[PDB]
Coordinates of all heavy atoms in Angstrom, one line a residue:
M1 N 135.0 126.7 63.1 CA 134.6 127.1 61.7 C 134.2 128.5 61.6 O 134.7 129.2 60.6 CB 133.5 126.2 61.2 CG 133.8 124.7 60.9 SD 134.9 124.6 59.5 CE 133.8 125.2 58.2
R2 N 133.5 129.1 62.5 CA 133.1 130.5 62.5 C 134.3 131.4 62.6 O 134.4 132.4 61.9 CB 132.1 130.7 63.6 CG 131.6 132.2 63.6 CD 130.6 132.4 64.8 NE 130.2 133.8 64.9 CZ 129.3 134.5 64.2 NH1 128.6 133.9 63.2 NH2 129.1 135.7 64.5
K3 N 135.2 131.0 63.5 CA 136.4 131.8 63.6 C 137.3 131.9 62.3 O 137.7 132.9 62.0 CB 137.3 131.3 64.8 CG 138.5 132.1 65.1 CD 139.3 131.6 66.3 CE 140.5 132.5 66.6 NZ 141.2 131.9 67.8
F4 N 137.4 130.7 61.7 CA 138.2 130.6 60.5 C 137.5 131.4 59.4 O 138.2 132.2 58.7 CB 138.4 129.2 60.1 CG 139.1 129.0 58.8 CD1 140.5 128.9 58.7 CD2 138.4 128.9 57.6 CE1 141.1 128.8 57.5 CE2 139.0 128.8 56.4 CZ 140.4 128.7 56.3
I5 N 136.2 131.3 59.3 CA 135.5 132.1 58.2 C 135.5 133.6 58.4 O 135.6 134.3 57.6 CB 134.1 131.5 58.1 CG1 134.1 130.0 57.6 CG2 133.3 132.4 57.1 CD1 132.7 129.4 57.8
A6 N 135.5 133.9 59.7 CA 135.6 135.4 60.1 C 137.0 135.9 60.0 O 137.1 137.2 59.8 CB 135.0 135.6 61.4
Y7 N 138.0 135.2 60.1 CA 139.4 135.6 60.2 C 140.2 134.9 59.0 O 141.3 134.7 59.3 CB 140.0 135.4 61.5 CG 139.4 136.2 62.6 CD1 138.4 135.6 63.4 CD2 139.8 137.4 63.0 CE1 137.8 136.3 64.4 CE2 139.2 138.2 63.9 CZ 138.2 137.6 64.7 OH 137.6 138.3 65.7
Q8 N 139.6 134.7 57.9 CA 140.3 134.2 56.7 C 140.7 135.2 55.8 O 141.7 135.0 55.1 CB 139.4 133.2 56.0 CG 138.1 133.8 55.4 CD 137.2 132.7 54.9 OE1 137.5 131.5 54.8 NE2 136.0 133.1 54.5
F9 N 140.1 136.4 55.7 CA 140.5 137.5 54.8 C 141.3 138.6 55.5 O 141.3 139.7 55.0 CB 139.2 138.1 54.2 CG 138.5 137.1 53.3 CD1 137.2 136.6 53.6 CD2 139.0 136.7 52.0 CE1 136.6 135.8 52.8 CE2 138.3 135.9 51.2 CZ 137.1 135.4 51.6
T10 N 141.8 138.3 56.6 CA 142.6 139.3 57.5 C 144.1 139.1 57.4 O 144.5 138.1 56.7 CB 142.1 139.3 58.9 OG1 142.8 140.2 59.7 CG2 142.2 137.9 59.5
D11 N 144.8 139.9 58.1 CA 146.3 139.8 58.1 C 146.7 138.6 59.0 O 148.0 138.4 59.0 CB 146.9 141.1 58.6 CG 148.4 141.1 58.4 OD1 149.0 140.2 57.7 OD2 149.1 142.1 58.9
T12 N 145.9 138.1 59.8 CA 146.2 137.0 60.8 C 145.3 135.8 60.5 O 144.4 135.4 61.2 CB 146.1 137.4 62.2 OG1 144.7 137.9 62.5 CG2 147.1 138.5 62.5
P13 N 145.5 135.1 59.3 CA 144.7 133.9 59.0 C 145.2 132.7 59.9 O 146.1 132.7 60.6 CB 145.0 133.6 57.5 CG 146.3 134.2 57.3 CD 146.5 135.4 58.2
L14 N 144.3 131.6 59.7 CA 144.6 130.4 60.4 C 145.2 129.4 59.5 O 144.6 129.2 58.4 CB 143.3 129.8 61.0 CG 142.8 130.6 62.3 CD1 142.3 132.0 61.9 CD2 141.6 129.8 62.9
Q15 N 146.2 128.8 59.8 CA 146.9 127.7 59.0 C 146.4 126.4 59.1 O 147.0 125.4 58.5 CB 148.4 127.8 59.1 CG 149.1 129.2 58.9 CD 150.6 129.2 59.1 OE1 151.2 128.2 59.4 NE2 151.1 130.5 59.0
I16 N 145.4 126.2 60.0 CA 144.9 124.8 60.3 C 144.4 124.3 59.0 O 143.8 125.0 58.2 CB 143.9 124.8 61.5 CG1 144.6 125.3 62.7 CG2 143.3 123.4 61.6 CD1 143.6 125.6 63.9
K17 N 144.4 122.9 58.8 CA 143.9 122.2 57.6 C 142.6 121.7 57.9 O 141.6 121.9 57.0 CB 144.9 121.1 57.2 CG 146.3 121.6 56.9 CD 146.3 122.6 55.7 CE 147.8 123.0 55.3 NZ 147.8 123.9 54.2
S18 N 142.3 121.0 59.0 CA 141.1 120.4 59.3 C 141.1 120.0 60.8 O 142.2 120.2 61.5 CB 140.8 119.2 58.5 OG 139.6 118.6 58.9
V19 N 140.0 119.6 61.3 CA 139.9 119.1 62.7 C 139.0 117.8 62.7 O 137.9 117.9 62.1 CB 139.5 120.2 63.8 CG1 140.4 121.3 63.7 CG2 138.0 120.6 63.5
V20 N 139.4 116.8 63.5 CA 138.6 115.6 63.6 C 138.0 115.6 65.0 O 138.7 115.7 66.0 CB 139.4 114.4 63.3 CG1 138.6 113.1 63.2 CG2 140.2 114.5 62.1
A21 N 136.7 115.3 65.1 CA 135.9 115.2 66.3 C 135.0 113.9 66.3 O 133.9 114.0 66.0 CB 135.1 116.4 66.6
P22 N 135.7 112.7 66.4 CA 134.9 111.5 66.3 C 133.8 111.5 67.4 O 133.9 112.0 68.4 CB 135.9 110.4 66.6 CG 137.2 111.0 66.3 CD 137.1 112.5 66.7
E23 N 132.7 110.8 67.0 CA 131.5 110.7 67.9 C 131.8 109.8 69.1 O 131.3 110.1 70.2 CB 130.3 110.3 67.1 CG 129.9 111.2 66.0 CD 129.5 112.6 66.4 OE1 129.2 112.8 67.7 OE2 129.3 113.5 65.6
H24 N 132.5 108.7 68.8 CA 132.7 107.8 69.9 C 133.6 108.4 71.1 O 133.4 108.0 72.2 CB 133.4 106.5 69.4 CG 134.8 106.8 68.8 ND1 135.0 107.0 67.5 CD2 136.0 106.8 69.4 CE1 136.3 107.2 67.3 NE2 136.9 107.0 68.4
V25 N 134.5 109.2 70.7 CA 135.4 109.9 71.7 C 134.7 111.1 72.3 O 133.8 111.7 71.7 CB 136.7 110.2 71.1 CG1 136.6 111.4 70.1 CG2 137.8 110.6 72.2
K26 N 135.1 111.4 73.6 CA 134.4 112.6 74.2 C 135.5 113.1 75.3 O 135.7 112.4 76.3 CB 133.2 112.1 74.9 CG 132.3 113.2 75.4 CD 131.0 112.7 76.2 CE 130.0 112.1 75.2 NZ 129.5 113.1 74.2
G27 N 135.9 114.2 75.1 CA 137.0 114.8 76.0 C 138.1 115.6 75.4 O 138.7 116.4 76.0
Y28 N 138.3 115.3 74.2 CA 139.3 116.1 73.4 C 139.1 116.0 71.9 O 138.5 115.1 71.5 CB 140.8 115.6 73.8 CG 141.1 114.2 73.4 CD1 141.7 114.1 72.1 CD2 140.9 113.1 74.2 CE1 142.0 112.7 71.7 CE2 141.2 111.9 73.7 CZ 141.7 111.7 72.5 OH 142.1 110.4 72.1
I29 N 139.8 116.8 71.2 CA 139.6 116.9 69.8 C 140.9 116.9 69.1 O 142.0 117.1 69.7 CB 138.7 118.1 69.3 CG1 139.3 119.4 70.0 CG2 137.3 118.0 69.8 CD1 138.6 120.7 69.5
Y30 N 140.9 116.7 67.7 CA 142.1 116.6 67.0 C 142.2 117.9 66.1 O 141.3 118.6 65.9 CB 142.2 115.3 66.1 CG 142.0 114.0 66.9 CD1 140.7 113.6 67.2 CD2 143.1 113.4 67.4 CE1 140.6 112.4 68.0 CE2 143.0 112.2 68.1 CZ 141.7 111.7 68.4 OH 141.6 110.6 69.1
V31 N 143.4 118.1 65.5 CA 143.6 119.2 64.6 C 144.7 118.8 63.6 O 145.6 117.9 64.0 CB 144.0 120.5 65.4 CG1 145.2 120.3 66.2 CG2 144.1 121.6 64.5
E32 N 144.7 119.3 62.5 CA 145.7 119.1 61.5 C 146.5 120.3 61.1 O 146.0 121.4 60.8 CB 145.0 118.5 60.2 CG 145.9 118.0 59.1 CD 145.2 117.5 57.9 OE1 144.0 117.4 57.9 OE2 146.0 117.1 57.0
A33 N 147.8 120.2 61.2 CA 148.8 121.2 61.0 C 150.1 120.6 60.8 O 150.4 119.4 61.0 CB 148.8 122.2 62.1
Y34 N 151.1 121.4 60.3 CA 152.4 121.0 60.2 C 153.2 121.1 61.4 O 153.7 120.1 62.0 CB 153.2 121.8 59.0 CG 152.6 121.5 57.6 CD1 151.6 122.3 57.1 CD2 153.0 120.5 56.9 CE1 151.1 122.1 55.9 CE2 152.6 120.2 55.7 CZ 151.6 121.0 55.1 OH 151.1 120.8 53.9
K35 N 153.2 122.4 62.0 CA 154.0 122.6 63.2 C 153.0 122.9 64.3 O 151.8 123.1 64.2 CB 154.9 123.8 63.0 CG 155.9 123.6 61.9 CD 156.9 124.9 61.8 CE 157.9 124.6 60.7 NZ 158.8 125.8 60.6
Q36 N 153.6 122.8 65.5 CA 152.8 123.0 66.8 C 152.6 124.5 66.9 O 151.5 124.8 67.5 CB 153.5 122.5 68.0 CG 155.0 123.2 68.2 CD 154.8 124.4 69.0 OE1 153.8 124.8 69.5 NE2 156.0 125.2 69.1
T37 N 153.4 125.4 66.5 CA 153.2 126.8 66.7 C 151.9 127.2 66.0 O 151.2 128.2 66.4 CB 154.4 127.6 66.2 OG1 154.2 129.0 66.4 CG2 154.7 127.4 64.7
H38 N 151.7 126.6 64.7 CA 150.4 127.0 64.0 C 149.2 126.9 64.8 O 148.4 127.9 65.0 CB 150.4 126.2 62.8 CG 151.6 126.3 61.9 ND1 151.7 125.5 60.7 CD2 152.6 127.2 61.8 CE1 152.8 125.8 60.1 NE2 153.3 126.8 60.7
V39 N 149.0 125.7 65.4 CA 147.8 125.5 66.2 C 147.9 126.3 67.5 O 146.8 126.7 68.0 CB 147.6 124.0 66.5 CG1 147.3 123.2 65.2 CG2 148.7 123.4 67.2
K40 N 149.1 126.4 68.1 CA 149.2 127.1 69.3 C 148.8 128.6 69.2 O 148.0 129.1 70.1 CB 150.7 127.1 69.8 CG 151.0 127.8 71.1 CD 152.4 127.7 71.5 CE 152.7 128.4 72.8 NZ 154.1 128.3 73.2
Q41 N 149.1 129.2 68.1 CA 148.7 130.6 67.8 C 147.3 130.6 67.2 O 146.7 131.7 67.2 CB 149.7 131.3 66.9 CG 151.1 131.4 67.5 CD 152.0 132.1 66.5 OE1 151.7 132.5 65.5 NE2 153.3 132.2 67.0
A42 N 146.8 129.6 66.6 CA 145.4 129.6 66.1 C 144.3 129.3 67.1 O 143.2 129.6 66.8 CB 145.4 128.4 65.0
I43 N 144.7 128.7 68.3 CA 143.7 128.5 69.3 C 143.8 129.6 70.4 O 143.3 129.4 71.5 CB 143.8 127.1 69.9 CG1 145.1 127.0 70.8 CG2 143.7 126.1 68.8 CD1 145.3 125.7 71.3

């Protein structure tokens, strides 16, 4: 969230839509995007 807010008004914004981090799960997180390249370059 901090990274998106800090890099939202720049020439390299993040195209991610949201991320899901359920409490029951522990070890990996989800992310929402159209293509894989978006998240690949956003992380």
Side-chain angles (χ1 to χ4, degrees):
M1 284 294 294
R2 179 177 175 85
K3 180 177 182 179
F4 178 88
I5 296 170
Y7 296 93
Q8 58 187 356
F9 296 109
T10 177
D11 192 13
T12 58
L14 290 66
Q15 301 179 5
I16 301 172
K17 300 299 182 180
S18 176
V19 301
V20 189
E23 299 296 348
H24 64 268
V25 68
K26 190 182 290 299
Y28 68 87
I29 52 176
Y30 305 88
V31 61
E32 184 179 0
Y34 294 93
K35 298 181 179 180
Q36 61 85 8
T37 184
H38 298 171
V39 298
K40 182 179 180 180
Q41 300 180 0
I43 67 183

